[PDB]
Write a protein that binds this DNA or RNA. Structure first.
Length: 908
RNA sequence: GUGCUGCUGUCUCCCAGACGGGAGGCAGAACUGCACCUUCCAAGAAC
DNA sequence: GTTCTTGGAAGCATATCGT
DNA sequence: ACGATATG
């Protein structure tokens, strides 16, 4: 719930006393992870050190329960299951037995304990009893418990019988009803545990002994890991049940006898050494009496008509059902249990100030942290190697059982930070010892005016919400690849000069400051990153074709043309007809590609290590191009290592577990660095301008009508999942006190921000956008225009809609489908009714007319005629896709005829 | 401290199979640059 | 060639009896 | 006051 940040410090050597504690803690943690799973009478799977999944059947779990101390782990199965469910938090969140999963150690791993007998905190009972006993009227208590409540806690404390509870209170400050409540409000888990102790199963035998705090830390880590495993396993079971449902759905749609005949066909085809796959099913479904390509003749041309004529017309759906069944039969039935290991899957050996783990004293001196750990054996003083994250630390103890640290995070700026440390954690990574300083952090307050403004601006026009009522500063973002970031900021109360934009129910605002960020830092390096990436992309295809050339002599016609038209030119090579020589030429080409990759990578490293340092930028397009080059080189190398797959199209999965490990590592690390630097740039631009509210492009959805952001080689979606990017930028803008919203990008890249009409984005000068103003042709930067459009959409609350879907009623009219509340708001404001239809006009356009609610059913009577259709807005009329592009093409032919010289430029 | 992140020399293990590729270790030289919540986890996709 | 929108586990509070 | 369980 709180805010968190962390970094690791390096402890050079740790005495043998702390080493032994680390290993014994890991041992006990593994023991608990094993014991909780065992307590469940449910088989599971383990990921062993070498990757092979064992299946621990009930035998090994029963033997483990026996070794742990249980004399007969057969009849006590149900109580153990209840306890396991309780400790892993699979119980009622209100009646939860163990709010923290480490509260169970004392009842389990100790001889003398009082769990389940103490009652001083169970409900508010004791506190309320003493409070009323502190000279407060019982009528007030009864009222506040019965009728003054609407959702308060007092309602949920009252598990007792009121007609008898209000008879107990006659006695002064009693505890008899307290014991009654203790034995009445039994939580199932703790009752099961008490039954187990009385039975004689508990105080189980632990591994190498430790004090209670170490046991609590081990239990916490084990419980965390097992709860993650349970969540993953539940999702796995859900997906497999969904697959079974899909199999049932597919099977219900065919004749079972025909499905059995198709099963016979598939079995015989497999006996013919052909495994059933979507590709061959589709190939066979093309034309049964015809001849399939050479890739399928061996398996098809000997079985296609051998008694399987009856299912020729149904082969398609029958193959679909067979594929569904064979997918369900092979998808994982569960998720394997990764298990704790001091060197293979370390846990955090944790130290806390309130019982969880053993205490520690965090100290600083001479620019380095001095950690002190109160191990049972004694006291251990460690010196941490200086860190530039926590530079020049200072630390003092607060009166809240916490340490307050003030430090400098080294950057261009050297801002001081302040956070609180309450838990510290050990870990052994690549042999060395580290401490995870997880520390708390309080961001900026975020003013109430900002929240009012956000609620106002994100709402549709048909929802009344209070006005911003303040001089907010809103800024837009347009995320991209080449220009990673473009912005435009307005002050919401001033229109001194610049591009103007309406604001909902306020004066007009001006985008005084607009800019471009990112872009090409160096031209040559970007061009070479682009070329070398293209070679790898096409090289893998050349390898794929060469392999099946060597296997089957000649390609099919179309795939052969692709080799000459696309692959050979784009993967510089002289195509040798000989099969043997193709290996050696391909290897030589891969050698050249690796040398070029090394050169480019070195130049990219000289960013910060040449006198040109000062002219580099926090983020440049090279980051994004370098990610694509790495991604494509991974594919090319993976194809080359797989060249000798003689079978040509048969699977040999498994093999090397590392392979291109260095390239995957580099890809992930460079992605992380790029995302971090990008978000730093956005946040710093926002702060420099005071943008307390930030409108953002919603990359989750792609505008199909755009030509730049739609393709694979230019999309951010190809490097990250869209959710991972905006969430990171959203979070730290918040941490700096800036609230941000996501706006739909539909037609923002191809609609004017001065005018409201469509235009042209150049296919050659990709960074320019053309439109018409005063019937003169002007141009602007295609990315600042997108930012202004996003901000304008945020500010006007989506007043102007550029696209509308419709369906063709047979009358010759189109009915508008409304599903987003912005559509309803627009259709209401422009016409006056919730729904409307587009009526043709003689000038080859359709006009909105609006409908009364009654005729909606009449329109629905015919709406089923056709599919959804797109319609686009121009100069106050609406026109169709085939004619929308015509108007854009007219502007295209006009611009190429006019030239850049006669075109004025808008400022940016 | 973790990355961005490399170079020279040099040793070792794998897949080729005589064209090449892929895990790692060790010793040097060049630069004092830019960022930094981590941990635990199994656009690609349909026809 | 023509279109569409991965989630989970964690990173401590305070109360009370006895010296 | 502070320490050792105990459990929101």
């Amino acid at each position: 719930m709180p805010s968190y940040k962390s970094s690791r410090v390096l402890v050079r050597d740790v005495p043998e006393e702390l080493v032994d504690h680390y290993e014994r803690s890991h041992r006990v943690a593994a023991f608990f992870m094993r014991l909780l799973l065992a307590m469940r009478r449910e088989p599971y799977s383990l990921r062993m050190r070498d990757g092979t999944e064992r299946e621990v059947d009930l035998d090994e779990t029963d033997d483990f329960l026996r070794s742990a101390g249980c004399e007969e782990p057969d009849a006590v199965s149900d109580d153990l299951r209840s306890f396991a469910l309780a400790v892993l938090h699979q119980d009622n969140p209100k009646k939860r037995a163990f709010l923290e999963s480490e509260n169970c150690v004392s009842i389990l791993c100790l001889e003398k304990s009082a769990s389940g007998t103490r009652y001083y905190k169970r409900p508010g009972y004791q506190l309320l009893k003493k409070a009323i006993e502190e000279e407060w009227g019982w009528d007030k208590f009864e009222a506040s418990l019965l009728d003054e409540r609407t959702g308060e806690v007092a309602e949920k404390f009252a598990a007792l019988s009121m007609e008898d509870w209000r008879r107990f209170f006659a006695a002064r400050d009693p505890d008899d009803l307290g014991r009654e409540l203790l034995k009445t409000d039994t939580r199932e888990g703790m009752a099961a545990a008490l039954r187990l102790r009385e039975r004689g199963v508990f105080p189980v035998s632990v591994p190498e002994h430790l004090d209670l705090d170490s046991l609590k830390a081990a239990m916490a880590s084990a419980a965390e890991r097992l709860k993650s495993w349970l969540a993953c396993n539940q999702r796995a079971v859900d997906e497999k049940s969904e697959l079974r449902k899909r199999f049932e759905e597919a099977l219900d749609g065919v004749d079972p006898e025909k499905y059995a005949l198709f099963e016979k066909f598939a079995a015989e085809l497999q006996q013919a050494d052909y495994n059933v796959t979507k590709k061959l099913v589709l190939a066979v479904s093309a034309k049964f009496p015809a001849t399939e390509p050479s890739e399928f003749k061996r398996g098809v041309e000997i079985l296609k008509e051998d008694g399987y004529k009856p299912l020729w017309e149904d082969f398609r759906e029958l193959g679909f059902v067979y594929l569904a069944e064979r997918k369900w039969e092979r998808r994982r039935g569960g998720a394997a249990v990764t298990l704790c290991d001091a060197d293979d899957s370390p846990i955090k050996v944790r130290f806390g100030l309130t019982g969880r783990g053993r205490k520690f004293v965090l100290s600083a001196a001479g620019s380095r942290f001095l950690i002190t750990v109160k191990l049972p054996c004694g006291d251990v003083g460690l010196t941490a190697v200086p860190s530039r994250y926590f530079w020049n630390p200072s630390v003092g103890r607060t009166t809240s059982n916490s340490f307050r640290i003030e430090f400098t995070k080294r950057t261009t700026e050297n801002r001081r930070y302040v956070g609180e440390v309450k838990e510290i954690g050990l870990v052994r990574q690549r042999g060395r010892y580290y401490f995870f300083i997880d520390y708390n952090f309080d961001p900026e307050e975020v003013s109430d005016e900002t929240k009012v403004g956000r609620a106002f601006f994100r709402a549709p026009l048909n929802e009344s919400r209070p006005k911003p009522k303040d001089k907010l500063t809103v800024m837009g973002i347009d995320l991209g690849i080449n220009p990673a970031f473009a912005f435009a900021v307005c002050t919401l109360g001033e229109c001194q000069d610049g591009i103007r934009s309406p604001v909902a129910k306020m004066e007009d605002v001006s985008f005084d400051s607009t800019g471009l960020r990112g872009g090409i830092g160096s031209q040559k390096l970007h061009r070479e990153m682009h070329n070398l990436s293209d070679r790898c992309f096409y090289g893998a295809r050349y390898i794929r074709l060469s392999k099946k050339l060597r296997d089957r002599g000649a390609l099919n016609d179309i795939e052969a043309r692709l080799l000459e038209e696309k692959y050979i030119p784009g993967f510089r090579i002289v195509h040798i007809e000989d099969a043997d020589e193709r290996r050696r030429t391909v290897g030589r080409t891969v050698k050249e590609i690796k040398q070029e990759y090394k050169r480019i990578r070195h130049q990219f490293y000289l960013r910060y290590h040449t006198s040109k340092r000062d002219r580099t930028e926090l983020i440049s397009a090279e980051y994004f191009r370098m990610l694509f080059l790495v991604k494509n080189l991974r594919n090319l190398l993976k194809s080359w290592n797989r060249y000798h797959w003689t079978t040509g199209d048969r699977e040999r999965r498994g093999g090397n577990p590392d392979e291109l490990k260095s390239y995957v590592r580099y890809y992930n690390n460079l992605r992380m660095d790029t995302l971090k630097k990008l978000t730093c740039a956005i946040v710093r631009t926002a702060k420099e301008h005071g943008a307390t509210l930030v409108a953002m492009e919603n990359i989750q959805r792609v505008d199909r009508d755009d030509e730049v952001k739609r393709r694979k080689e230019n999309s951010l979606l190809s490097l990250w999942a869209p959710g991972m990017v905006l969430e990171r930028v959203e979070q730290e803008l918040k941490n700096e006190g800036i609230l941000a919203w996501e706006v739909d990008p539909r037609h923002t890249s191809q609609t004017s921000c001065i005018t409201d009409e469509f235009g042209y984005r150049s296919l050659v000068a990709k960074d320019t956008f053309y439109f018409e103003q005063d019937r003169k042709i002007h141009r602007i930067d295609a990315d600042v225009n997108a930012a202004i459009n996003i901000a304008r959409r945020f500010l006007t609350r989506y007043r102007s809609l550029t696209q509308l879907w419709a369906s063709l009623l047979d009358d010759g009219r189109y009915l508008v489908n409304v599903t987003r509340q912005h559509e309803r708001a627009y259709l209401e404001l422009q016409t006056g009714a919730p729904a409307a239809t587009l009526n043709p006009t003689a000038e080859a356009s359709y006009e909105l007319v609006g409908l009364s609610p009654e005729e909606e059913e009449l329109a629905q009577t015919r709406i089923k005629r056709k599919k959804r259709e797109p319609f686009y807005r121009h100069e106050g009329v609406w026109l169709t896709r085939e004619k929308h592009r015509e108007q854009v093409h007219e502007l295209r032919n006009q611009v190429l005829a006019l030239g850049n010289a006669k075109i004025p430029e808008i400022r940016t």
